Amino acid sequence: PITKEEKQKVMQEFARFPGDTGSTEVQVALLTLRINRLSEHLKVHKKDHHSHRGLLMMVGQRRRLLRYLQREDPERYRMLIEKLGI
RNA sequence: GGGCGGCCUUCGGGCUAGACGGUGGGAGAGGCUUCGGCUGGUCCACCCGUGACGCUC
Ligand SMILES: [K+]
Ligand SMILES: [Mg+2]
Ligand SMILES: [Mg+2]
Ligand SMILES: [Mg+2]
Ligand SMILES: [Mg+2]
Ligand SMILES: [Mg+2]
Ligand SMILES: [Mg+2]
Ligand SMILES: [Mg+2]
Ligand SMILES: [Mg+2]
Ligand SMILES: [Mg+2]
Ligand code: NA
Ligand code: NA
């Protein structure tokens, strides 16, 4: 579920400025937030499988944004890859 | 890795129409499950955010 007391909390942390909600960093962060939030899920329910499909999709998406931000803005890439760790 | 890709530009750099994110909706014979839930995807809107971040073996 996550909720604002989570999804907004992350954004308010990775935002590049007071209203940022879609800046690659924010996009990656909250992307890494539900990736875990579901890695954990899959454990309790090892028979789900179907949900793993997205685990894979989310993971790919996260790596494609990161690669993008690694070309256009190296500095910011190391920054972001921290507070989360790649 | 490969192949093919938006607009403008005096090539320095701009920009949003794509994609993604935020928010708010919808449809559903998804899946797992102490049956109490946990969860994947999917389609819309806006005229919010990033700014081609894409599509393809
Ligand atoms: K499915
Ligand atoms: Mg696809
Ligand atoms: Mg440029
Ligand atoms: Mg999506
Ligand atoms: Mg709803
Ligand atoms: Mg049900
Ligand atoms: Mg759900
Ligand atoms: Mg917009
Ligand atoms: Mg730029
Ligand atoms: Mg291009
Ligand atoms: Na223009
Ligand atoms: Na193409």
CA distance A69 to A73: 5
Which nucleotides along chain B are within 7 A of a protein C-beta? 20-23, 30-33, 37-41, 48-54
Question: What type of residue sits at position A84?
Answer: L
* Residue ranges of domains in chain A, CATH in brackets: 1-86 (1.10.287.10)
User: Cβ within 7 Å of strand B: which of A 20-49?
Assistant: 20-24, 26-27, 30-31, 34, 37-38, 41, 44-45, 47-49
Residue pair A55/A38 in contact (Cβ under 8 Å)? The answer is: yes
Q: Give the determination technique.
A: X-ray
Resolution of the deposited coordinates, in angstroms? 2.8
To 5 degrees, how large is the angle CA A34–CA A50–CA A26?
A: 20
The residue assigned the tokens 């996009």 is: A27
Which residues make Cβ contacts (< 8 Å) with residue A32, sequence separation at least 6? A62, A84
